[PDB]
Amino acid sequence: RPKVRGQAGRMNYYWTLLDQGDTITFEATGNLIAPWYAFALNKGSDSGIITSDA
Amino acid sequence: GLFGAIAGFIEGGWTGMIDGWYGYHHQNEQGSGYAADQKSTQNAIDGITSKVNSVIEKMNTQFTAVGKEFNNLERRIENLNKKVDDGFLDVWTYNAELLVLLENERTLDFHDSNVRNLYEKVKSQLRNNAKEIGNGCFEFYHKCDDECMESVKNGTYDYPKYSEESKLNREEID
Ligand SMILES: *[C@@H]1O[C@H](CO)[C@@H](O[C@@H]2O[C@H](CO)[C@@H](O[C@@H]3O[C@H](CO)[C@@H](O)[C@H](O)[C@@H]3O)[C@H](O)[C@H]2NC(C)=O)[C@H](O)[C@H]1NC(C)=O
């Protein structure tokens, strides 16, 4: 496949929300990009994203 | 519809009158006039205040509304989203403009009705001794001072006090 930013490989990114309690297991034999930090989320609704230059 | 008073049988307004919307102008033995009618103008202020507050409180405020994002294989849903936003915007702008346009004729006719009723009251409590002359003026065959002026204003005229004496002067002019 053609080069982008001088690289011919590609990489895919994934995400998952755990719950409280429940576990998760990674199991790999060739290509893992392991997580190294993660995030614990609060609540409080009605936010968003704004594109502005003010 | 148009009740016929404002810019009708009564000519233009009075700049010299300040403290109200509807009032009188009297010329007895010792002065000129421009006194307001605090009874009717208070009812007009109450009606208009309630009207504006009602129009404000029918419209709910909106909460957070932020745009969404779609990739190149979700064109169909993206067009649906745009259709929903444009439809609701058209409906609300229609409602706003139409509400203001109808409310304006309602309020102007309301003022016109108030002026006509305020004229009819004064005519009705001066049945014989007045001789109305044009654009809402009267002319007292008998003699009047400040007390009978206030007596007209409040709505307590007691016509049979003067009913004979006026009659004499009327038969003088006829
Ligand atoms: C509407 O107007 C009438 C006037 O026709 C008001 O009644 C009047 O009240 C005034 C108060 O200043 C009276 O004037 C004074 O009364 C005192 C007390 O008797 C007297 O000592 C003074 O010499 C002077 O007369 C006025 O006489 C009285 N009306 C009469 C019969 O002349 C009335 O209060 C006003 N309000 C309403 C809603 O009627």
The kind and range of the H/E element at B83 are helix B75-124
d(C-alpha B149, C-alpha B23), whole Å: 12
Neighbours of B118 (CB within 10 A): 19
Q: Confirm if B121 and B22 have CB atoms less than 8 A apart.
A: no
Q: What is the resolution of this structure in A?
A: 3.3
Chosen CATH of B1-174 out of 3.10.310.40, 3.90.20.10, 3.40.309.10, 3.40.50.150: 3.90.20.10
Phi–psi pair at B59, nearest 5 degrees: -95, 115
Query: CB within 8 A of B149, min separation 6: which ones?
Result: B26, B28
Q: What is the DSSP letter of B144?
A: -
Place of tokens 């009207």: B51
Q: Confirm if B129 and B141 have CB atoms less than 8 A apart.
A: yes
Separation of CA B153 and ligand 1 centre (Å): 13
Task: Give the determination technique.
Answer: cryo-EM
Query: CB within 8 A of B135, min separation 6: which ones?
Result: B9, B10, B11
Separation of CA B145 and ligand 1 centre (Å): 13
Which two structure tokens, joined as six digits, stand for A12?
């895919």
| Alpha-carbon distances of B125 from B37, B83, B122, B154, B156, rounded to whole Å | 16, 64, 5, 11, 8
Question: Nearest CA to CA, how far is A23 from chain B (Å)?
Answer: 31
Burial of B83 (0-12, 13-18, 19+ CB in 10 A): exposed
Judged by a CB distance cut-off of 8 A, whether residue A48 touches chain B is yes
Question: β-strands B35-36, B23-24: how paired?
Answer: antiparallel
Which two structure tokens, joined as six digits, stand for B5?
């008073």
Judged by a CB distance cut-off of 8 A, whether residue A44 touches chain B is no
Question: Nearest CA to CA, how far is B65 from chain A (Å)?
Answer: 8
Q: Confirm if B152 and B122 have CB atoms less than 8 A apart.
A: yes
* Domain range list for chain B: 1-174
Q: Confirm if B116 and B4 have CB atoms less than 8 A apart.
A: yes
Place of tokens 């067009």: B79
Which two structure tokens, joined as six digits, stand for B11?
């000519």
